[PDB]
């Protein structure tokens, strides 16, 4: 139906947003201001998004779902129009900030329409197509923006944002919220400062301080939806597996940038053609299948640390076995969360499931990188790599053990 046809247009408003991150050198000359200041400028999108998606979901919960999805898609016009209009330093900041709060509005609200769309059985067709929207949307955000920068430029990648954000609409109470964003703002850049940096132990405080001040100040959930969310976090911990693998292959074994692309796009095509098999797979069975078969995905790439001549076989099967496992768990976990969550409080509950997904990644990457960067500094590339891949196996096993607290 044209229920998802518009929704995916709002998820592709978050492909164009996270494509410009991989084309920072082009707009450093245009906007003029040096790298390091213009980089953090583009960073603000997923920054503002991660801290407001909870609130913007809880305000969409009351103010209206399609009301907020109308706000977001309208705010996605100015978000892109502001940047593409004129390139200059101070303006570039604000343009990404609103691009960030634009996503915070869309994600939880469009996740609530899906429950109204079906309310059982024909909901899995929608949530699967939603997963295609995000995983395809993020999966090629880089490979797109780069291909666009080559021929057309950095300008014609953000004019596609306004027109798709309109075509989407064509198919259409501060209870510590301020001490929530301050905990997230900090926690979001505790992983980034964790690598860079002191504010290393200093910024961990304002997270823990604004956590307990927010703990005793909408917190009300007790169902398997909790299990589906906690499992989602632990599974996204093995996101680092891919980045540490791409590094190892391209630096250690010394392949070209295109080979890295073929191994990666193989994983991308696989995972997008399993979320389809995910809905057919269904709750606990496929999520146990996914959380398990991903751990194999690692093991095949872990064993490439002790390689041979025909271990490109053992590495490839890894990318496939890793890719499909995410796809299998992909469309059942989003359902088990979206279903069990109360119809009254969907906007609040969905934002929490999406952030728990977000932090999981950033958290996993930080560990995977730090371990790799440490282990490769201590011992070698091949050795140090496996140490990082192993740390992912543990999280992937914990994600398989995280299903223990998720009954049928």
């Amino acid at each position, epitope marked *: 139906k044209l229920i998802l046809g518009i929704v995916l247009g709002v998820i592709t408003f978050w492909l164009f947003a996270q494509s410009l991150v*991989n*084309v*920072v*050198p*082009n707009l*450093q*000359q245009s906007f003029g201001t*040096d*790298m*390091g200041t213009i*980089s953090i400028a583009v960073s603000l999108t997923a920054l503002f998004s991660g801290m407001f998606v909870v609130g913007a979901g809880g305000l969409a919960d009351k103010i209206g779902r399609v009301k907020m999805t109308n706000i977001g898609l309208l705010l996605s016009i100015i978000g892109s129009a502001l940047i593409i209009i004129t390139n200059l330093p101070a303006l570039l900041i604000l343009g990404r900030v609103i691009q960030g709060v634009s996503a915070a509005c869309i994600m939880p609200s469009t996740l609530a329409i899906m429950k109204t769309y079906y309310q059982g059985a024909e909901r899995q067709r929608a949530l699967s197509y939603w997963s295609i929207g995000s995983w395809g949307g993020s*999966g*090629i955000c*880089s*490979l797109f*923006g*780069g*291909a666009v*920068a*080559t021929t057309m430029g950095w300008r014609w990648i953000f004019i596609f944002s306004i027109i798709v954000a309109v075509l989407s609409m064509l198919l259409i109470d501060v209870a510590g919220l301020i001490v929530l964003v301050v905990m997230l703002l900090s926690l979001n850049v505790v992983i980034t400062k964790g*690598a*860079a940096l002191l504010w290393f132990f200093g910024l961990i405080a304002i997270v823990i301080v604004a956590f307990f001040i927010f703990l005793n100040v909408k917190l009300f959930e007790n169902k398997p939806y909790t299990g589906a969310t906690i499992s989602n976090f632990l599974l996204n911990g093995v996101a680092g597996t*891919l*980045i*540490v693998a*791409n*590094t190892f292959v*391209q*630096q*250690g074994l*010394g392949y*070209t*940038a*295109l080979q*890295a*692309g073929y191994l*990666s796009i193989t994983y991308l095509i696989m995972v997008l053609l399993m979320i389809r098999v995910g809905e057919k797979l269904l709750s606990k069975r496929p999520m146990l299948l996914g959380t398990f078969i991903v751990v194999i995905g690692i093991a095949l790439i872990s064993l490439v640390f002790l390689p041979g001549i025909f271990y490109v076989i053992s590495c490839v099967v890894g990318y496939l076995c890793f890719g499909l496992g995410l796809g299998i768990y992909a469309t059942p976990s989003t359902d088990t969360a979206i279903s069990n969550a109360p119809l009254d409080k969907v906007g609040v509950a969905s934002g929490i499931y999406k952030m728990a997904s977000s932090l999981g990644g950033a958290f996993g990457v930080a560990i995977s*990188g730090a371990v*790799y*960067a440490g282990a*490769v*500094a201590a011992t070698s*590339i091949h050795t140090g790599a496996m140490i990082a891949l192993w740390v992912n196996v543990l999280m992937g096993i914990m994600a398989f053990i995280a299903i223990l607290f998720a009954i049928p």
Partner: nanobody
Framework: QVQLEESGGGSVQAGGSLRLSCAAS???????????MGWFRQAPGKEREGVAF????????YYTDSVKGRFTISQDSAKNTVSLQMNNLKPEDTAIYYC?????????????????????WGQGTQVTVSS
């Protein structure tokens, strides 16, 4: 937290040859990304000038006019490091050579040269030539 440990260089007679190596510690690649890497020279007289740069992903090299043909930047992929093999060195080449690398980007995007783009810099290695 990405150190650039650089080695080689030093003094030699004019019309001679010199090696300059530089590796990047704990610099990881994103899902469809790479980074560009090379040297800038700066004699006590003139200001910071670009020499030779290479895109780590697909050996996409770029040189300045001055050094074109004599200098040959390249990456020892198995040992993981870039190195600028300099030849027929003229006394203009006498300066402090700084190994640098820019923030990562889509591998589809082209190699970089402008000092504004490069963000990671090495302590600097000295090279001098004479009669």
């Amino acid at each position: 937290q990405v150190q650039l440990e650089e080695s080689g260089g030093g003094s030699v007679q004019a019309g001679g040859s010199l090696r300059l190596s530089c590796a990047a510690s704990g610099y990881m690649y994103s899902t469809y990304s790479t980074y560009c890497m090379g040297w800038f020279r700066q004699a006590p007289g003139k200001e910071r000038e670009g020499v030779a740069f290479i895109k780590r992903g697909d050996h996409s090299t770029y040189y300045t006019d001055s050094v074109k043909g004599r200098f040959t930047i390249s990456q020892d992929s198995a040992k993981n490091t870039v190195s600028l093999q300099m030849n027929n060195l003229k006394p203009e080449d006498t300066a402090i050579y700084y190994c640098a690398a820019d923030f990562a980007h889509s591998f589809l995007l082209s190699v970089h040269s402008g000092a504004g783009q490069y963000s990671y810099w090495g302590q600097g290695t000295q090279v001098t030539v004479s009669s």
